[PDB]
Amino acid sequence: DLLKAVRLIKFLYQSNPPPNPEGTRQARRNRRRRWRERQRQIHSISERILSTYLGRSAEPVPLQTVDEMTKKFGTLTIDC
Amino acid sequence: QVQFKLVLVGDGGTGKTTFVKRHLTGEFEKKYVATLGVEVHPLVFHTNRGPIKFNVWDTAGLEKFGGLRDGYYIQAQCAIIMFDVTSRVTYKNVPNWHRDLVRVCENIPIVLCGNKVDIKDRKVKAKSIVFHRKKNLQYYDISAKSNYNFEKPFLWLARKLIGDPNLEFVAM
């Protein structure tokens, strides 16, 4: 029921055998950016699959940039 | 009392005279009057363990004004080699000074000091300063102008002499 989603995620991780890093620093820049877009897509797929039925647990992950902010505020030194 | 014979080697008035004056008065000399022969200056520090006296022999660094030259090193108890990081030549001359010092003083602490690091134009990069490594010299980047590491060499020499590794200078 749950192990299958985990195997699916691990496969999707394993299904992207990065790119082959060859070429000049600008062609290699472009490969870095392409692999980064691939990572973006992988993370998006993972997060959406989480939203399917697991989202109820991992939804706050993008939203942590407001709770971390409520923690960054309130740094009050009311005492020593 | 509790004084040590210190010998300063380097290009004359290229920082040795300036360094001695700066530790003496605190002023940072601008003029370059190349040192003639040697000048012996008392220079007192106060450590957690009492007073300390350096008999600093600021020697001339110009051959024409070397005078007695190596004779100044006789009975030296510590040595501070100097060089200007802005001029590689004064660095390549470092091994010659080290040779002469060890030849006269076989077993004495040696501090390799790069003067006037404050001046933005640094030629002798920190990477290439290595002679102390094999020779086992204690190195310091210093600058008599801005006093960067202004005290580190003297503190190190005092620790090596008295034997107190954690000895610390005191204001008074």
Binding site: R36, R40, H43, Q64, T65, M69, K72, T75, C80 | A126
Partner: protein, 151 residues
């Protein structure tokens, strides 16, 4: 400075060799600070300097997540402590760290606004060193993210 640059280069190469281990080592030492085992200004300063050293050396997603974890734990630690000295030290280190990571800042406008507002709060602080550190971090953030201030 050459010492720091050499250490930074070595650590960046090691991170590019395996960054997960470096990330987790950072997290473990941060926890050591949190739990009071390794608590000392010197140790926390060294940890935060090291964390800054690898700024941008990792991929943005992993760097973002690691920075979020670090900042959250540091905020918890700040909440834990009393005493002006320790809180000021923690704040200074946190601000240095965030300064070292401009990419994350450019990815989050609200975070930038929060950092700058907290800098303005600090600037009125009298305790030694707070204002200087805040100004330094502010100039660094300006240099690295000027585009997002005027747009």
């Amino acid at each position: 400075i050459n010492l720091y640059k050499n250490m930074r280069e070595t650590l960046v190469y090691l991170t590019h060799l395996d960054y997960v281990d470096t990330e987790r080592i950072m997290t473990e030492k941060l926890h050591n600070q949190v739990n009071g085992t390794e608590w000392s200004w010197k140790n926390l300063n060294t940890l935060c300097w090291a964390i800054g050293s690898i700024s941008g050396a990792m991929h943005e997603e992993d760097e973002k997540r690691f920075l979020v974890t670090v900042i959250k734990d540091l905020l918890g630690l700040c909440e834990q402590k009393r005493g002006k000295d320790n809180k000021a030290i923690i704040a200074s280190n946190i601000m240095y760290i965030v300064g070292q990571y401009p990419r994350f800042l450019r990815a989050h406008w609200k975070f930038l606004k929060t950092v700058v507002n907290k800098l303005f709060e600090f600037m009125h602080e009298t305790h030694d060193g707070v204002q200087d550190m805040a100004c330094d971090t502010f100039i660094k953030i300006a240099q690295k993210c000027r585009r997002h201030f005027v747009q």
